[PDB]
Design a protein around this ligand. Structure first.
Ligand SMILES: [Mg+2]
Ligand SMILES: [Mg+2]
Ligand SMILES: [Mg+2]
Ligand SMILES: [Mg+2]
Ligand SMILES: [Mg+2]
Ligand SMILES: [Mg+2]
Ligand SMILES: [Mg+2]
Ligand SMILES: [Mg+2]
Ligand SMILES: [Mg+2]
Ligand SMILES: [Mg+2]
Ligand SMILES: [Mg+2]
Ligand SMILES: [Mg+2]
Ligand SMILES: [Mg+2]
Ligand SMILES: [Mg+2]
Ligand SMILES: [Mg+2]
Ligand SMILES: [Mg+2]
Ligand SMILES: [Mg+2]
Ligand SMILES: [Mg+2]
Ligand SMILES: [Mg+2]
Ligand SMILES: [Mg+2]
Ligand SMILES: [Mg+2]
Ligand SMILES: [Mg+2]
Lengths: 52, 50, 122
RNA sequence: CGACUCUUAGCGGUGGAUCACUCGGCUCGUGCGUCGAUGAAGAACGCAGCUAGCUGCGAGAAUUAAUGUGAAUUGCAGGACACAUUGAUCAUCGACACUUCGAACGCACUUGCGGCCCCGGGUUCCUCCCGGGGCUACGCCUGUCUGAGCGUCGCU
RNA sequence: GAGCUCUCGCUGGCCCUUGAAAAUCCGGGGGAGAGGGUGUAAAUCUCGCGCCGGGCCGUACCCAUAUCCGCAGCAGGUCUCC
RNA sequence: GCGGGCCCGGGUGGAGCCGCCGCAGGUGCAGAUCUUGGUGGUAGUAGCAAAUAUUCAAACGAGAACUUUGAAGGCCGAAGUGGAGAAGGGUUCCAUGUGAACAGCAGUUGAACAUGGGUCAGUCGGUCCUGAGAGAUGGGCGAGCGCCGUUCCGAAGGGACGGGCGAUGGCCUCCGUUGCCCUCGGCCGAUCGAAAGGGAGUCGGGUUCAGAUCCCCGAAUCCGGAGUGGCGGAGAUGGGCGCCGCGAGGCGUCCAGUGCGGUAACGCGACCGAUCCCGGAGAAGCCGGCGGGAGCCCCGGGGAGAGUUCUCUUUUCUUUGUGAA
RNA sequence: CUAAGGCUAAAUACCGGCACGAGACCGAUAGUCAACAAGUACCGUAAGGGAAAGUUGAAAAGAACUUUGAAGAGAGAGUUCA
RNA sequence: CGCGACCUCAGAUCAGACGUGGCGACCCGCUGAAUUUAAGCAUAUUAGUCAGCGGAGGAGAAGAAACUAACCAGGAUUCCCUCAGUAACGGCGAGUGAACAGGGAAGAGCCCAGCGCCGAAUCCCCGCCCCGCGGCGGGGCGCGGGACAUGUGGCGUACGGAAGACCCGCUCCCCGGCGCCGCUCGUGGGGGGCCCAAGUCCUUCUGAUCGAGGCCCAGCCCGUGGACGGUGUGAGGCCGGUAG
């Protein structure tokens, strides 16, 4: 659920989430857009996790 | 139909994932008798009669 | 780097949980590396980490269930999962004490007229 | 001598007949003769570095543990292992684990709505809310508790 | 501008045809009860702001002389709006 | 050798085979509109003719009647060959590349093939309600799987307020929870049944190769919670009496105070209240006539951009606005 | 003989299941439909219907390289006893 | 006006258990036809068969005479041969059709109600202690509960039984654990794992021998091992196995 996704992201990446938008892809996998709070930057955490 | 249920969507997703062709490195195995997927499904014929 | 059950048998529960957490973090990082190209060496570690996680969880579960069945050893009523599971019909079978049970009439007959050993032509 | 047409022969085409091979069938016979509410048969969905099908497996998901054996798997890289080490693969398999439907069990089958307890986030039980854990089907036997009767009786 | 379409509102005609149920929301009749006692309280079908949350599923495209059904890119068939 | 057939020569072939004495059989094909598979004449033949129509130049490209670009000529002529949906389809959608096979010519093209990408919601719908109907329990039948029936041969509501007791928890002040006792209580059959019926609440601009009333920006709104009430405001600060003080005003006491205005329809930001009862909305057919509002069309002009100007035309063509709350 | 009460192994059957053995049986249009990714592909709304399809070589040693062609395709060369 | 027993009847997310479905070759209980034959067809036949329903196990069912016989009698049930295509049934047509005795395979008998005698002498559940507890038992300690006199248990059932009288000789069977020696017939019971003989000998063919010739006797060695399969053909001795 979106609450579970928000809590999991918060616990994993030590981030605060504004909102989460989810969808089911036409392959069986669930895709979620995690909106970050204005205090944190998505590019910085993306560099930290390794994706760029 | 753009108004599908969850079960139908999962079924369609599984069929779509199964529709892919056979990888090439399978042919290089020792005991291999397979040349093509032979189960490819097109959307014009064999209309998946759900 | 190999994880073996022999070392995990004696480790405390909290140490095993911490090791499981570390392995799960490593597996998540391996998945992130897998979806970002990565390398063959990185990709071959996914199975190793998955099997290490399986070993840690197997040790945890075996130790927990052994302790739990040690606790219930002696109690008349035990949890269903700890009861012996042979078959549906074999659990409905007699208790092995009633099969040996004999009525007073049967015991009287057997005691009074036991089967004897005999031979002929002499 | 022309072209076309007819017969025969050599060679070259279409086709896969015949023969020889066979990890497959058919028939007879021997021993054993075992499913399930501690959740059967069957079905669905997922699981491999590269993986469609078959086969195997169940979020511990191409297998975990233990035992036996003892140097591989292999289509390619990667490699764990020192193969003077419980030690790679295999076979056995007695420990653990075993998603969703399904006799299928809170109510219906949309994966939608609920109730009873405990813990954590929020609290400093405060009820909203969120997450996790255990329960909540029918019939029936023994026993317990709480009950009804202008049923049969006894005292006041 | 009897101009076309949509909408709102009056007024009539027809029935031996009289033209849906439930969820849900609201108003009214009563006063069982509460309040503090002379500066305060019980109440606000909450008057104006202020704080927190709203979970799950579908969402691409065709919708038809070529993405549907007729063995097919078949002169056939297939419910609507502008 | 009459014959059924057989023995040698040559070539190919690469792994088993035959004679004789007996035994046994799924043992001999020209037909059965026989079964399966393959191949001919027909035959390079019928045919590639329903719905007006194409032409020029350039580009890519080995290759152009069919691709793309520009120009010209046409058609569909707002009940369209336009723009969006429902059922159905299920990746056919988007980008890149190939031209093996398919698109009854071709193709540099495709809905073909191979790689990747793409569907973001409290407000849009399912989810809630019931309709026609379906279908459990109670009951009855049936050898039986089951069937009949949905109120009928039922001890059918496990809910609630007010009071009492008992217990725990939390500054056992104050409250919540649970258990018991008293009390109150009609419903009408569990349940399912509509993405076009009923059903509170979101719009404007921008944005992608492909998604946007869903993403971003900016403005709102509905429902639920709100304990310790976060605030203000309404219940609200009236009169009499006895004193003090020039007065404003201050003190003590008796009370009133669950609002106010208008003759009226009714109005004012609020303006105690239970079990119970009544009513309304939801909640209604078809057709005719008339009137109001909006969108579009029409006319007289101002601007802005523009085709014609060999003659005329203060010219003809396009645009000229503001969301919900 | 003593009904209207009850129990009991053995000699018996076994086209399903588990694990074995054998054959005067068939040898890929045969033998089970299925020797192979077979109750699979595919057909029908459904109950259901249901195939075709084995063989390079001892060893891939599976034709490097040169040349024409855009390529499919050829000409040389090479491997192998072939 | 309430309380206390009993009888009938409800509620449970009350404590602990049990049934549901699947397979179904063989088995048991029901239901149950028409093709077909009769050269037509209606009784018959197909046929207690297929189809349908329900219920188990490793087997099921049956089973120890309310029997067969009429003999100088036999003696539970099940299966084989024969009885026997017979007695009998049947538009006496087509057709259908057993049983007894005899020979075998196997062989095993028993228990209640009632009738009566024993102080319910009987059984289930919960607490504690000891043993083992992975097919939850045994003993003891509980004025701890319940069931039972609307009848539990002991003796005892058609072959007779019970109690006394007194004739005769005398006192081991079963259950639950603790361990132990013999490895218990395919000639070591079952399952699993690791192993145990002998040419790659000399020439010669071939792409490659497992081919051919020869080697103290068909030839060199083993043989209680000369089955089979693999290995570049056709291998007792190359390898796994084979015999023991
Ligand atoms: Mg079609
Ligand atoms: Mg007795
Ligand atoms: Mg769309
Ligand atoms: Mg067309
Ligand atoms: Mg022609
Ligand atoms: Mg026209
Ligand atoms: Mg259109
Ligand atoms: Mg496209
Ligand atoms: Mg073509
Ligand atoms: Mg409904
Ligand atoms: Mg065949
Ligand atoms: Mg006849
Ligand atoms: Mg006839
Ligand atoms: Mg006839
Ligand atoms: Mg009959
Ligand atoms: Mg019996
Ligand atoms: Mg007899
Ligand atoms: Mg005779
Ligand atoms: Mg008695
Ligand atoms: Mg061989
Ligand atoms: Mg050999
Ligand atoms: Mg040897």
């Amino acid at each position: 659920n979106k609450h579970q996704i928000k809590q999991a992201v918060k616990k994993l990446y030590d981030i605060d989430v504004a909102k989460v938008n989810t969808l089911i892809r036409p392959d069986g996998e669930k895709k979620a857009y995690v909106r970050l709070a204005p205090d944190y930057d998505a590019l910085d955490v993306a560099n930290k996790i390794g994706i760029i | 139909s753009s108004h599908k249920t969850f079960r139908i969507k999962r079924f369609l997703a599984k069929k779509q994932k199964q529709n892919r062709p056979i990888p090439q490195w399978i042919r290089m195995k020792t005991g291999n008798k397979i040349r093509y997927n032979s189960k490819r499904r097109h959307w014009r014929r064999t209309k998946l009669g759900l | 780097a190999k994880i073996k059950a022999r070392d995990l048998r004696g480790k405390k529960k909290e140490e095993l949980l911490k090791q499981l957490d570390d392995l799960k973090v490593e597996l998540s990082q391996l998945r992130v590396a897998k979806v970002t190209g990565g390398a063959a060496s990185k990709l071959s570690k996914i199975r190793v980490v998955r099997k290490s996680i399986a070993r840690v969880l197997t040790v945890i579960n075996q130790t927990q269930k052994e302790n739990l069945r040690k606790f219930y050893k002696g109690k008349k009523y035990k949890p269903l999962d700890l009861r012996p599971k042979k078959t549906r019909a074999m659990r409905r079978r007699l208790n092995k004490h009633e099969e040996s049970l004999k009525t007073k009439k049967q015991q009287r007959k057997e005691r009074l007229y036991p089967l004897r050993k005999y031979a002929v032509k002499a």
